[PDB]
Symmetry: C6
Subunit: 104 residues, 6 copies
């Protein structure tokens, strides 16, 4: 998919839970996966139209502060990822989340 990708990483799982919920409730985006990065850091990945990923990312960043003890470590938006990156890195749509992609 050439949809934009957003990635956000928190210290602690509760922060990433808060961010993920805000993202998919505010932008027409699909949460496609998460990573245990080590050192109690967790990464989440969303896909969607670039403008919707921007809106979702802002909501996710602000939601991290609603989780006691959570910290926002790092985030990025890649507006139009190369197929090789989507293939190798864990950022692709998958069959588990297809029905949410259809909904966007």
């Amino acid at each position: 998919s050439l949809d934009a990708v957003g990635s956000l990483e928190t210290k602690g799982f509760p922060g990433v839970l808060a961010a993920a919920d805000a993202m998919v409730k505010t932008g027409r985006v699909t949460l496609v996966g998460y990573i245990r990065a080590g050192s109690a850091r967790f990464t989440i990945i969303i896909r969607g139209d670039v403008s919707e990923v921007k809106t979702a990312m802002d909501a996710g960043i602000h939601a991290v502060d609603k989780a006691y003890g959570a910290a926002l470590e790092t985030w990025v938006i890649i507006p139009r990822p190369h197929e090789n990156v989507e293939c190798v890195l864990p950022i692709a749509y998958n069959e588990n989340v297809e029905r949410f992609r259809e909904s966007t």
Copy 2:
């Protein structure tokens, strides 16, 4: 499920054991899973009605201090989590815990 979700994370396993036991003894909630987060941190996840998750979370927060050397690192309650989140993050009810629902 549209049930509320609570998640709490401690430094050390004993603290998460203390917290989890307090949660399910005080709220009508289901402990659905836990995560080894790395750095000796452990995450637990509960589901239930919003009122019961809040009650359980309060009891769990206070219970962490009963474990010598434990620290409460972070926690959150999401009253009405989006179905997409439940699908990807390890927060769903599962068949292992069905009898506790």
Copy 3:
């Protein structure tokens, strides 16, 4: 099982080895499992009658000091753990340790 649970976590494996041996030799308790917690920390879990878990735990705490370089990080006793906790967390009796439960 409604038996009490004790859990103890050390910095380094040698400390948890010392503690486990002291625990099962002091109380009528079963060591049911251990966890690699990360950051070179190791968790052990015992089950048994609450009074036996208390005496075993006392011995385990003191035994950690017998390992050079070990640190006792954290421990707890839960006298009557809820079945949902026993199910999800790695604290249940299991078939690998059945013969030790029988002997207690």
Copy 4:
């Protein structure tokens, strides 16, 4: 393959995502894999002609700064890696990325 190898490692996943996308869009190179290195560090590996790996690597280094909170930790280019290194370390071309090698 005697193609050069480039490897770059960031603090946080978003930085490695930014770097990978820049690399494969700038040089005629293939992203062959990534590593979760621990401590929330992530490694990516590209292969291609040495001149293409150099230009891709330059773009990847600069792209890390486009991810909030990311840090560039370490990187290297090996112009003509030994077959024993390609065998043991996770740097070989693989069937998952064949179509991207063909296009280079």
Copy 5:
């Protein structure tokens, strides 16, 4: 087995390689396993008669200093481990090392 157990943990793998080789060359002991403990710490476990484990452990401790950059973090000798500890923790003899046990 009621043979003694020795456990030694280093920062870095080279230190544990040095210690393991010194142990089995100096005491009539068997190296039965190792653990990746996290945080670049490595644990090794030897078994044998208590006096031989003592001799091996001293040689292993001194060998750690022969590895550049290695640090000895923690160690213990448990002279006669309870069968429950041997069962749950990774300290038992195994079929991979039987021929070295026979040799001791």
Copy 6:
């Protein structure tokens, strides 16, 4: 095998890639495996004649500095490792690397 063993560990993967390539290009040695040690440290292991492992290790130590941001954390050479060590620790020749022997 009674061949010598060398092991070297870096902070970051690029440093270990640099070191490994220098080793097999300078000594008649076989790189038999590597370890993700945690904390972004990576271990590599070579086997060969004592003289070749020493030569390869020297080249590998110097090569770590050619990787931006890499650090050499620790290394050792065991000229004649005990067979018990080869059995338990991941330092043996293996079928994946047979052609390099």
